[PDB]
Design a protein around this ligand. Structure first.
Ligand code: AKY
Ligand code: FAD
Length: 492
């Protein structure tokens, strides 16, 4: 289909409210619904000629709703572009940005029995997920998704003011390899518009597609372990915390049995009823069941309370395609993350318990992700995802329904964060204990001095020593600063 232009058209509301986060709703003059890269070129050229500030939506999961900022006048929506295929020529797999993770997972698996180590949520977009290095349950095993990025097709704009389509590959002799590099965890609205991504494991021989990317697990064995809040004490919570963290520091970053395990520890508040440890592993590996109960046995060894355990073995795709991320009306969110190099302290664990145990008036939680593994095998400088020596990733949030309570919710999430990172100035500064935070977790509070961040800039936080190299890319492929937003890479 030819390019579509949505201006005071009946399709407007639907397009402007596609964002995941109900807090931010767009008001651009127009939305362009694109179907080909050439259409993307046209749309860009039309907005520049109208001086419409551009934004791209693929998946709409942007936690900070950047695309829906009131300064945006042009929104290019890629949701009609979700083609996925293999190219025998290129020895690579075709995936368009409009595709959902759930769709790519299903297409890659059924035709070839393979996958990519991407995120968990099935409705997440490929478009703004891969270029910032979205990770998931198989990262431990196979690394970041961008560890399997061969090439990217992008629409960029000339110093002369011209939109152009360009291809950037990971070949050493490719003059655009720095553009490819930029797309391996530089993040979303900075370098142009990706129209197609190419995947192949750098260690991949031959012409057989089934052996050109990691193979899906035989099955998914799951244990959900839950501990009720009423039987939880500050002391037992802390043993659990300290126990969890000591294990993650001993068990990861290699190609071992436990490299294939993933867990999320949902540290819910005292309204939620319980804290939940959600663990999974390939049901086809030897003594699979044994590694899982050995881990939880390590998790609550010095504890005073005994958890519940629910076990199940399901087909990998079925388990993978659960829409168990139901918003349930509570569509407003605020969140903030961190990369841990070493476990929380005695004091941080205690910050955690008090703020979670409290009769807050808001739905708060702390999630801890098992991490490391194969991701830690790539040199920090080898991709634009620098964080390559962390053992756990954390994501903290508040979720609500009524905008009248934005103030109470916002207060909550900021307070827990600043307090556990208080010894630095309320932020996870890359040092011997952390490695900053994750670009797909934007937090514009990182640029507010009337809060946290003591002495360290936001870009140190997200990219460490990799930022200058990203600045030089910004200048070469987007000299006119056509692609920007609040937490945007700046030219030097
Ligand atoms: C599941 C049922 C219910 O809990 C749903 C809802 O709870 C959230 C929890 C998550 N959140 C945003 C952190 C979930 O995010 C998702 C998507 C996210 O983007 C997250 O995904 C991660 C996963 C991995 C990543 O790396 C990363 C950051 O994203 C998360 C794991 O799950 C999701 C959207 O749902 C919820 C409920 C009940 C109440 C609230 C809820 O939010 C309330 O918020 C609330 C209140 O504010 C005031 C009074 C009462 C209540 C409630 O009773 C339940 C329900 O709705 O059924 C009726
Ligand atoms: C909603 C949500 C997000 C999740 C979830 N789980 C994740 C996980 O398991 N691992 C992760 O690593 N990340 C997870 N995320 C967090 C992230 O939001 C996602 O990984 C992605 O950011 C989602 O991207 P997308 O859905 O495409 O959202 P958009 O708002 O459209 O884009 C975000 C960002 O990217 C830019 N952008 C979009 N499209 C393009 C193109 N084609 N080219 C360049 N840049 C693009 C946007 O402008 C914006 O800046 C689980 C849940 C439920």
């Amino acid at each position: 289909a030819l390019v579509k232009v949505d201006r005071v058209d009946r399709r407007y509301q639907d397009l402007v409210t596609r964002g995941f986060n109900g807090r931010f709703r767009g008001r651009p003059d127009v939305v362009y619904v694109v179907h080909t890269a050439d259409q993307v070129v046209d749309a860009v050229n039309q907005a520049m000629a109208a001086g419409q500030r551009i934004a791209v939506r693929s998946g709409g999961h942007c936690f900070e709703g950047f695309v829906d900022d009131p300064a945006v006048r042009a929104v290019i929506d890629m949701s009609q572009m979700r083609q996925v295929f293999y190219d025998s020529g290129k020895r690579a797999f075709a995936v368009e940005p409009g595709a959902t993770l759930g769709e790519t997972y299903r297409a890659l698996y059924l035709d070839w029995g393979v996958t990519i180590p991407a995120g968990v949520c099935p409705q997440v977009g490929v478009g703004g997920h891969v270029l910032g290095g979205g990770y998931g349950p198989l990262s431990r095993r196979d690394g970041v998704v961008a560890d399997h990025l061969y090439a990217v097709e992008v629409v960029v704009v000339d110093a002369s003011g011209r939109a152009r389509k360009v291809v950037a590959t990971s070949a050493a002799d490719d003059p655009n390899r720095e553009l490819w590099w930029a797309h391996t965890g530089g993040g979303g609205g900075n370098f142009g518009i990706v129209t197609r991504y190419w995947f192949r494991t750098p260690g991949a021989t031959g012409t057989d597609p089934s052996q050109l990317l990691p193979k899906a697990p035989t099955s998914t064995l799951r244990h959900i372990v839950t501990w009720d809040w009423s039987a939880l004490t500050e002391e037992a919570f802390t043993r659990i915390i300290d126990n969890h963290g000591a294990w993650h520091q001993s068990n990861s970053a290699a190609g071992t049995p436990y490299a294939s395990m993933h867990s999320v520890f949902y540290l819910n508040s005292r309204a939620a009823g319980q804290i939940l440890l959600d663990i999974q592993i390939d049901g086809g590996l030897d003594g699979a069941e044994a590694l899982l109960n050995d881990f939880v046995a390590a998790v609550n060894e010095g504890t005073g309370v005994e958890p519940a355990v629910q076990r199940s073995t399901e087909p990998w795709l079925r388990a993978t395609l659960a829409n168990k991320f139901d918003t349930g009306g509570f569509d407003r969110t605020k969140s903030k993350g961190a990369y841990l190099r070493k476990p929380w302290t005695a004091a941080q664990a205690a910050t955690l318990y008090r703020h979670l145990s409290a009769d807050s008036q808001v739905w708060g939680e702390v999630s801890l992700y098992s991490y490391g593994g194969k991701v830690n095998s790539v040199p920090e400088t080898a991709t634009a995802t620098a964080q390559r020596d962390s053992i756990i990733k954390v994501w903290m949030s508040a979720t609500w329904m009524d905008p009248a309570h934005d103030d109470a919710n916002l207060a909550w999430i900021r307070e827990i964060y600043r307090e556990i990172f208080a010894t630095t100035g309320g932020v996870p500064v890359p040092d011997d204990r952390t490695e900053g935070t994750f670009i797909n977790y934007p937090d514009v509070d990182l640029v507010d001095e009337r809060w946290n961040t003591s002495g360290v800039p936001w870009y140190t936080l997200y990219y460490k020593g990799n930022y200058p190299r990203l600045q030089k890319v910004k200048a070469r492929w987007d000299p006119r600063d056509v692609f920007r937003h609040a937490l945007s890479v700046r030219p030097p």
